[PDB]
RNA sequence: CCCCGAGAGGGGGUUUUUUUUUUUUUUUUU
């Protein structure tokens, strides 16, 4: 029971967007040159994410070294000031966060060509400065951009998106208010394909609605890919022209 | 700042502070500025070119008429844009069919109304949603439109920005509708907008106040009475601030609860507080502080010296609270308090009549009058009117605006004219809406959910037909029982048939009994407006006059109705039981049937008894009755109750107009036939749905009656008739009630039954997760579990049970709304309230018509004394089913010589037409002269009785 | 609660109740478990302190290689008075800087000298208090290191005056550490003199303890 | 405990129904007065290996 | 396989958290 107009009869949402509109998507490449080999600053809505890619480089411990592939590590730092209400405890060892880090690794292990960087380590540090729904999808886009900036070989883009289901109405790119009022589905689409790297459903969804929700997400993720690709070629032209 | 995006879309930052529980949180949301916001006008030729479809691929409809209400220049044709205040104050006038036809409601207004008053916001949205050819309301999202969106200027209050926002919308609409010669009128009571438009600094905007606008309409005199508005010896104290009471509740200083004000005493109220055992009394008129009965009020405990015998700091107030709890346990002195805040008013549209005392016939101008509300527990209201002579002897609908600390009586305004008092039209309409019964016809959105076929809908001949299966893939699960001999036994004028029965004798000696219930679920689907209205009404009310249906006529009295000679969908329950009516097995299945014949209760009984007709159908009907006797036998032996209250049936003269005859409905054996199989159906379904959904099963329980309820009845029985009711068990209560019979008068047993029915606990609906299994017990039926299932057309509870049974058998997955413990709690609390309102309205309908039969007639009827007091007696007339009060003054002569013995419930007095001391005990059959007279104060047709 | 300790029932709530210049005591080498140990007890006015220091080293460090030794200092809360972990870490860092100027690290390649200071009994009898404990810590660590046989450039001691703590070496000519919380303004010269007096007294008693005992 | 501490029950509301959390009395220890622990001295054993 | 040396020698092929509009009779068909 929501007293707010999540989806008005006029087809308008609480923030003004319609059912199939992405939030403000602004990417940024090479933001921390003196701190990492690759870096990206993501702004997807009110979401603010710093992503740092450090590597490929020498492992700090020879015990943890693979002679056939690079070691891929991801650490997500959800800051205590990411939400409106400051969290008292840290999230560093939170099981929810360990799953997120693990999830991201399992995604890019099959995209990043780790086999061509044996005996090395790729460390991915992430700092979430502000959070407002669809943080998982934004995490995916931040890593993909930062990895490309580092000149690390990969097969294709991986675009992330979230889709809510308000009763029967699908809502592309959900914010915090919408996620609190409905079940959402997080997608990780590879390139322009229909293949999903990540399918994440944490709340109840009718089996009949799931296929349609996936269809909306994939279409939306393709637009995220285009925006990422667009901003990347723009930065490429501004650098290659000097 | 403001960012421009690729789609021509913009985005800014909406930041506000949310104060909650003394906390301060900075809330920030992004605010998108569009460019494709439709004006929603029929005249517009630009907007439809820029409009986009929604989620369900449906473009929004332009509803604002191309030729609105034309008014004297320079207004001409015009649209109306509303302010926040004029909506909150005159929502009744905004629903009036005779004004406000094309209205534009800004988003900022809709938002402010939602925050200030949610119920008004709902009513405003309903006006927008239910737009027809008479009334048209829209919502222009001005905050989302880049053309109309304004931002707070440096050093500007939020109230002035919002007023400027509304004014900007009017300015935009005006310029946008210039080529169509349609002006815009801003209806606002705020002096800021009127002054800003009067000066005409920037753009030309037609601004009118509410009263000033009404005076420009053709029917100004007909709608001026709907405009919301020394008169004291003392003055009520001001209410505490919201911030104060919020801190008071949090610091255990103030307490909130619902206040009760009795019609016997308007100077004393009592609040039910959780921290206190016994209700806190509120003595005085200043202490009640303009509170109504049923209002949620916040009270402050008065000093101990101000308490009734039948501080500075917060610390002392909490100590006073503890001393109050102690005093309530001692039962010597009882704590008092005073209301200091009204949380939630119980105000609504009330029905009443003008008091002839406060209206001057000589006056021609506007005058103040009083209206006497039909609620005897409620005060009277002041009304501003000019048609005081035209509303003199009529039932009127009024709504309370406010109750100033100065004014002695609350202020309100006129709404509708129901009609002349004691008329079938006005009295029935007043009767319904006083018990909160929606009688208005179903909206267009509701009727659109009905099948596209209409009345020519038909069940498919073949249940495997490609076309039929393509449309209905669940049709393969549908069983075929059209070979069975189904018949329906319902009252004469019954068109809405819910149940249908049949019976066959299986080759193994056992019987096959099938109860078939209307398949309403197949037509009403969760989420639709049809289902929404169905849940809202909860149940259809039954009056002698009319019949307010829960579902549309097309659905309830045709399609879903198990009419004879036609193929109908049904939810069937088939048993296999022996000759001793013992269930061997039971199966639930959705099926398609065809009723052989729709019998009447009298028609069915005659066909069973005549012994001339021995066809297969009649042979099954007798088999049903035979099994009905067995089932009723076992049930009573199990401890089933046999209460009674056979109310009278108003036999309206079908040769004239007004009702003339009052008869009594007789229970035939066919009534026991249907009853027994309906109970059997409900029981089996209850067991099945609870087994499938143990936590959200729509059930119905009946609490065991407390000893205190029967201690008074047993007191009168053991004293006068020297008898008693066991109360040890339901069977014990039934057996002792059964032997409670007087040989000199057969009706004595009926009188005790109809009187012991009044002291039974109310049965209520609930969900299986709210209580434990032993609490599922139904005392009056002596069953471990029970529900309602057999009447989905007239009960929404059965609709829920149907959907749950369908999921139980695996026909179709149960909707999420019937598996949410929270949603189920709301459904149960609603249908429980609608159920009570249904029976009360039903009994009130009987009361009016019977009261009209005895209007101008006097007859010596048979009466029975049910209540004996020192102020008089109360006698019941079984012939008319009306209880009457005989006051001591009209009971006998010399009231000082009469004596009342409470121990024996005896009232001795000397009759007016005699001089012999007569002792009138209780339960006595006495001769009583009936007479009806409308009270000049309450305007209620009461039955004055004079004993003989 | 915790699966490694017995902390009792969770519904239980702790018991809350209603309403010369310095006297020293020094002892060394009473802990056979380690290489060096010291007991420092001080009693003055309305505050007494009994702390124990323990030096473990030089022991193995299995990581890379270092030409000099690596010192670590950890302060532990005692039984009575507790302190913030942050505050104990801060003093530890301040103490590390001091003894990295005194300990002849060159004599202990690829070795570790782990110094523990137990704030065993700190009674507050007044019917940032950590500043008054600092000079006693330095005294304990100096005694323990000397008792362990770890080479020191000079006997490091300290003093405290109005929230200001300063540790001296070389007869008070130079400073190996400066600490200041609260206090007043332009009171540096007065604090240096008062602390040097405490430094001199502590150093004399330390030498007297390392020799005679 | 305090004779009559102002802090009484705390009302918590559900979805329609109301409930009251029992008043929690703050137990306080005496600054001076104390009683000796009642140990079964017959049972006190001493350790050796 | 790769590096090194006028003479088939040597070096390497990596190690638990945005969930709360409160009120007076059983049962069946209407
Ligand atoms: Br709506
Ligand atoms: Br309370
Ligand atoms: Br209808
Ligand atoms: Br037929
Ligand atoms: Br434990
Ligand atoms: Mg029926
Ligand atoms: Zn337009």
Notes on the structure:
The structure is cut from a larger assembly and holds chains A (242 residues), B (948 residues), C (213 residues) and D (49 residues). Chain A is built from 4 helices and 9 strands. Chain A has helices spanning 95-108, 135-149, 176-179, 210-240, and strands at residues 25-26, 38-44, 47-57, 71-78, 121-130, 158-166, 169-172, 183-190, 196-201. In chain A, the strands form 2 sheets. A 5-stranded mixed beta sheet of chain A has the order 1-2-3-5-4. With 948 residues, chain B is an alpha+beta fold. Chain B folds into 5 domains: 1-232, no CATH class; 233-325 and 334-347, no CATH class; 348-419, OB fold (Dihydrolipoamide Acetyltransferase, E2P), CATH 2.40.50.700; 420-858, no CATH class; 859-948, Nucleic acid-binding proteins (OB fold (Dihydrolipoamide Acetyltransferase, E2P)). In chain B, the strands form 11 sheets. In chain B, strands 4, 5, 6, 7, 8 and 9 form a 6-stranded mixed beta sheet that branches. The longest helix of chain B has 33 residues, at 821-853. By secondary structure, chain D is mostly beta strands. Chain D has a two-stranded antiparallel sheet. Chains in contact: A-B, B-D, C-D. The complex binds bromide ion (5 copies), magnesium ion and zinc ion. Residues 125, 129 of chain B line the site of one bromide ion (BR). The structure holds one RNA strand of 30 nucleotides.
